[PDB]
Each structure stands twice: as structure tokens, then as C-alpha cells.
Design an enzyme around this catalytic site. Structure first.
Site, PDB file in Angstrom:
ATOM      1  N   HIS A 163      22.769   5.073  17.128  1.00  0.00           N
ATOM      2  CA  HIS A 163      21.334   4.727  16.355  1.00  0.00           C
ATOM      3  C   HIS A 163      20.397   5.512  17.208  1.00  0.00           C
ATOM      4  CE1 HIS A 163      20.745   1.296  19.309  1.00  0.00           C
ATOM      5  NE2 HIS A 163      19.742   1.812  19.398  1.00  0.00           N
ATOM      6  N   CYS A 175      18.602   0.800  25.292  1.00  0.00           N
ATOM      7  CA  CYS A 175      19.942   1.127  24.533  1.00  0.00           C
ATOM      8  C   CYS A 175      20.310   2.227  25.193  1.00  0.00           C
ATOM      9  CB  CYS A 175      19.602   1.339  23.158  1.00  0.00           C
ATOM     10  SG  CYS A 175      19.569  -0.107  22.162  1.00  0.00           S
ATOM     11  N   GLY A 218      14.154   0.534  24.138  1.00  0.00           N
ATOM     12  CA  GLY A 218      14.452   1.777  25.111  1.00  0.00           C
ATOM     13  C   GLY A 218      15.318   1.693  26.163  1.00  0.00           C
TER      14      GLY A 218
HETATM   15  C1  M5X Z   1      17.471  -0.168  21.852  1.00  0.00           C
HETATM   16  O1  M5X Z   1      17.114  -1.022  22.821  1.00  0.00           O
HETATM   17  C2  M5X Z   1      16.760   1.155  22.127  1.00  0.00           C
HETATM   18  O2  M5X Z   1      16.558   1.774  23.251  1.00  0.00           O
HETATM   19  N1  M5X Z   1      16.256   1.516  20.927  1.00  0.00           N
HETATM   20  C3  M5X Z   1      16.521   0.527  19.904  1.00  0.00           C
HETATM   21  C4  M5X Z   1      16.176   0.382  18.631  1.00  0.00           C
HETATM   22  C5  M5X Z   1      16.732  -0.750  17.988  1.00  0.00           C
HETATM   23  C6  M5X Z   1      17.271  -1.946  18.351  1.00  0.00           C
HETATM   24  S1  M5X Z   1      17.636  -3.447  17.752  1.00  0.00           S
HETATM   25  N2  M5X Z   1      16.376  -3.982  17.200  1.00  0.00           N
HETATM   26  O3  M5X Z   1      18.091  -4.155  18.692  1.00  0.00           O
HETATM   27  O4  M5X Z   1      18.089  -2.958  16.444  1.00  0.00           O
HETATM   28  C7  M5X Z   1      17.527  -1.589  19.805  1.00  0.00           C
HETATM   29  C8  M5X Z   1      17.517  -0.553  20.453  1.00  0.00           C
END
Ligand code: M5X
Ligand code: M5X
Lengths: 304, 304
Positions: A41, A145, A143
Site C-alpha cells: 500500500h 506501516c 507512518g
Molecule cells: C500505516 O500506518 C502507514 O504507515 N501508512 C498507512 C496508510 C493507511 C493505513 S490504514 N488507515 O490502516 O489503512 C495504515 C498505514
């Protein structure tokens, strides 16, 4: 003396953390040998996340669109590919700090440490359990992830988790390092049901053994029970049913303390039926389930 | 989303851990630049520990009697000296992994991470608070002496604690990196009283702010209180008295949540007077005091 929710030393994992940017999205990546692993993602805008067609979105991307930065140096991307929900970015340099490692898919009820990271930088480390419903109750902000979960066996790091999602319920979802989600979760910003969670019975009993080893004995009683009788109480209080495999794993702890596993089950049954009566066990006012029998033995013996 | 008892990433400290042997005693040391720091009781046998004359015992020792091993390589000791309760062994090689560092003496109520080590090897990392009575409720077995507590500010490690003792009460005592004990403790195997411990009020309030930020709001009420009224309840429940300095440190959290510090004091007063009524806050069934206002802001904002 003392019992703490201890995480593994995070040094070997810190040396693998990189930042990955694709367009305007930035998250963490894991650099092992000449490959950087990150959630797929990273190619999405928050707008794409509502219903992403990952195959179509990745086709618009080239090796030069993935910016990988380790500390302050730039990695050259020479390949990209999607495996399940992770992207594997082939880089031209092997990470000189790559520890000995394995990729493992943990079972629910098992524990691991998480090195929470932001923009490729480690902020902290904590011990988690993979819930029976395959969620983790972590601490993750936007951030985070790409942050990974792991266990360490002497000099080998077994990576078991990569963070992908913060569900609307406040719990966390992610994948193993092959990109397969733990549980029924998808990498889409949609309402997703986590199943009914249960307490990890074998871990609570292992923690009760840790309390006996450290002096907290008040909960021990003059009673015993059977696996069938205990499982009736477990059912009522949403505890995982105890099997002979679980009893067998508690063997070493039962041997060191001289307390039969079914006698510890009767203490747990009394705690479930009567509560703690305002008392604590190992500094906790509820029954802790995030220590496996292996964690307890390791901590109580001082394995490094 | 989520709030966890998070430790600092331990990598910078892992690269400083060495093993120190003197005669038949082995414990951990901290190698920074060309100096190895360790508890002076490394020169004692368990027999000497009942009433040691450290000056006399050190005189029987020479640089060649201190065996310092980093991983698998041997360090050459070219000097030794006792400063308070630590030994500083001058080695001929500066540690190439010495991070930027400071030695600090923390205040009671402040928090830090401990990298528990055995035989020079890291086994785990956890977050502690220095109790108001200057003990720590850690997890330390024999051979854990020399393990250090620390905080990290970007690339600087501030060492604040070195483990020396496991008191008969099961709590832990140690020194700053200049060898001065926190509290009235001495490095002698004798009965030593830890004073009456109190709960760190400012940290409990900071943790209540962390609960509001993450969704746990059930404890919020329609009441307010005064510092004097709250301190009467604090006295009754063995809580540290709240000062205007504590209120001031809670300023940023009060600003981010829009909850006046004295309104949060009234929620805490109601929790103290009425208990939790079988409910939890951030997954805990008691009032947590091992998160400072700084820890909460750092975790809730994602500082790396
Ligand atoms: C994750 O924490 C990151 O670094 N970027 C991102 C974007 C979307 C999500 S979500 N809302 O849980 O789909 C998580 C993260
Ligand atoms: C400390 O854990 C160590 O490594 N060696 C040692 C010896 C004696 C004590 S005690 N009983 O607390 O005085 C602690 C340690």
C-alpha cells in the site's frame, strides 16, 4: 527476581530499517541482503486505499519511483515485485548489517517483539501476542506501516509480522514477510470484522507459574480439576480450550515448581469465577495472557 | 492508535555490553570509549558480600585480574579505579560502537529502559520507572549486575542506571554511572529498608491523558477539584502530592485534549475513591504510573 513484559534486544532489527517513498506515500521497509520488504500500500494515495486495484497501481510504477533511504544514504532499486500484500524492491547493495534470519508465520497465542518505526527510524520496542483472532493490540500511528515483529534465537532473527493496518476498532492487522495477512483482513480502508477474541489460556497458566516462581502464591488453593471441567469454565469466560498439547508445553514449569498443571487450572478456575478481590499478581490486576510457556522459562532462567 | 509500555530501541546500548570477570565473579560491564564501567562488587566472592571492605579487596587486584570480553574478543586492561560503587577499567581500545552519550542522574518518578544482560549478552529490554523510594521493580537474576538503564534523545544515549542489587523484598537497587546509589542502599548483602513507596501522581494523570487520546473516556466525570482537595485524597491513597510544577508539565496534554488538569484530577479522585468497578483503562485494571508526561507525548506523536 521480578517478572516483566520484556521485548527482545532490537539492535539486529534496527540495522535493517529503511524508509520507502513512492509518490507522496512514505512508510517503513525492511532491508535484508539485497531486498527491501514493505507493504504494497506504499503505492496508494489515501484516496486509492478505499478500493485499491494493486496490480493496476503497481503497473504505473517503475524502479526509479521507489525511493529507498537507509539512515541518510540512498539505495538504488533494480527490481520490484509484489508477493501477496508486500513489495520486494531489489536493491543493488546487500545490507552489511543483515543478521542471520528466517521468515516465519507465527501461530495465534504466540508472542513477538515489535520495533515501532516512523520514516525508517526506530522509536521503540514492545512485546505483543498474536491474538487468537489474528489481530495485535499494538501502538501504531500513521507512518508505522512496514514496522516488523520478530523473535530472536541466539544470533538468528525470525521475522514474523509486518504492520499494515489500523482497523476502525483500534486494533492492528498485518502480514507475515511473504505478504499473507494474519486473519481475514485485506489491505483496504473498509470496515473489517475481527472475530470474537479469546484469552490465551496456556499463556495465563504459564504466567501463573511465573508468579509462583517470583513469590506471588496467594491464588494457589486446595483444589484440583479435570481438563473437561476446566474447559467448561474456559467456555463461560471466553478462554481458549486447554488441550493435552498445552498441558505438555507446561511440563517444564510444572516440574520446576512441583505444581501439577491441573492444580494450576483449579487456581485459574477460582480466579475466573471469583475475580482477584482487589489483589494483584505480578503487579497486574487482571490475568495476563501475553507470556508463552517459552517466554516464562527464558525469562526465569536468563537465556541470552 | 494503541498505547504500550514501550522501551527505547536498545541497539546503541547492545554495542557497549561486555563481560567482566574477576577471580570467580562474572557480571556485565559497559564499554564507552576506552573505559569499561561495572559494579565494584565484581571483586567480591558471595562470602565477601556480607560485609565487604572494597578498598582492601581492590588492593589485592591488578589490571591483569580483570578479564574483559566483548562478544568473543579480549580487551587489554591498562588501568583500574574505583569511583563510589563502580569500577572504571581503562582499556587500550576505544569501543568503535560507542554512541554519543551522557551520564545522568535521573529523578524519582522518571522512566528509562533497561537492557537486561547475562555474561555480557543482552537478553531483553523493558521500560522502568525509578520509584519515589529509589528502587526499581525490574526483572533481574544473578549475573544481571552491570545491566544499565538509559534514555535516548535522537542519537544521544543518556545512561542513568547500573544494576547492583536484588533486595530481600524482591525489588532492585543500583547506581548512576558515577557509582552513587539511588536511595539509601549500600552494596552489601544485608537487610536494607526501602522507604514507603508512593504512586507517581503526575504519571498516572499523564496516562489518563493517553487513555483519552486513545478512546478510553468512561472515567471522565462532571466534576472538578482543587490542588489542596486532590492532595488530601492523594495523601489517603499514598500518591505523591501534586504540585504546580506537575500541573505545568501536563500543560501540552491538557492543551491537546481540552481537558483541564484539575478536571483530570477529579476523575483520578473518583477512581481512587471508587475503584475501577471491574473496568479497564488502556488494557489495565489498576492505575498505571510508569509513563511520564514526556513519554505520553513522545508515543502519541511518534517521535523517533
Ligand atoms: C500505516 O500506518 C502507514 O504507515 N501508512 C498507512 C496508510 C493507511 C493505513 S490504514 N488507515 O490502516 O489503512 C495504515 C498505514
Ligand atoms: C548481580 O545480579 C550479579 O550479577 N552478581 C551479584 C551478586 C550479588 C548480588 S546481591 N545478592 O543482590 O547482593 C547481586 C548480583
Amino acid at each position: 527476581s521480578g517478572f516483566r513484559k520484556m521485548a527482545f534486544p532490537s539492535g539486529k532489527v534496527e540495522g535493517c530499517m529503511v524508509q520507502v517513498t513512492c509518490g507522496t506515500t512514505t512508510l517503513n521497509g525492511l532491508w535484508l541482503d539485497d531486498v527491501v520488504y514493505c507493504p504494497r500500500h506504499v503505492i496508494c494515495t489515501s484516496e486509492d486505499m478505499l478500493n485499491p486495484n494493486y496490480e493496476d497501481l503497481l503497473i504505473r510504477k517503475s524502479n526509479h519511483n521507489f525511493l529507498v533511504q537507509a539512515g541518510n544514504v540512498q539505495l538504488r532499486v533494480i527490481g520490484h515485485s509484489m508477493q501477496n500484500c508486500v513489495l520486494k524492491l531489489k536493491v543493488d547493495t546487500a545490507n552489511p548489517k543483515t543478521p542471520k534470519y528466517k521468515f516465519v508465520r507465527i501461530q495465534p497465542g504466540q508472542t513477538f517483539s515489535v520495533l515501532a518505526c516512523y520514516n525508517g527510524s526506530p522509536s521503540g520496542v514492545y512485546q505483543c501476542a498474536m491474538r487468537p483472532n489474528f489481530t495485535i493490540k499494538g501502538s501504531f500511528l500513521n507512518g508505522s506501516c512496514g514496522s516488523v515483529g520478530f523473535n530472536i534465537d541466539y544470533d538468528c532473527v525470525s521475522f514474523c509480522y509486518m504492520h499494515h493496518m489500523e482497523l476502525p476498532t483500534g486494533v492492528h492487522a498485518g502480514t507475515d514477510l511473504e505478504g499473507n495477512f494474519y486473519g481475514p483482513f485485506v489491505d483496504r480502508q473498509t470496515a473489517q470484522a475481527a472475530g470474537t477474541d479469546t484469552t490465551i489460556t496456556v499463556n495465563v497458566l504459564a504466567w501463573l507459574y511465573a508468579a509462583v516462581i517470583n513469590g506471588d502464591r496467594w491464588f494457589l488453593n486446595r483444589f484440583t480439576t479435570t481438563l473437561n471441567d476446566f474447559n467448561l469454565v474456559a467456555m463461560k469466560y471466553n478462554y481458549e480450550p486447554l488441550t493435552q498439547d498445552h498441558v505438555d508445553i507446561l511440563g517444564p514449569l510444572s516440574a520446576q515448581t512441583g505444581i501439577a498443571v491441573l492444580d494450576m487450572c483449579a487456581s485459574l478456575k477460582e480466579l475466573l469465577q471469583n475475580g482477584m478481590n482487589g489483589r494483584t499478581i505480578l503487579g497486574s490486576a487482571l490475568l495476563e495472557d501475553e507470556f508463552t510457556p517459552f517466554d516464562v522459562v527464558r525469562q526465569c532462567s536468563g537465556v541470552t
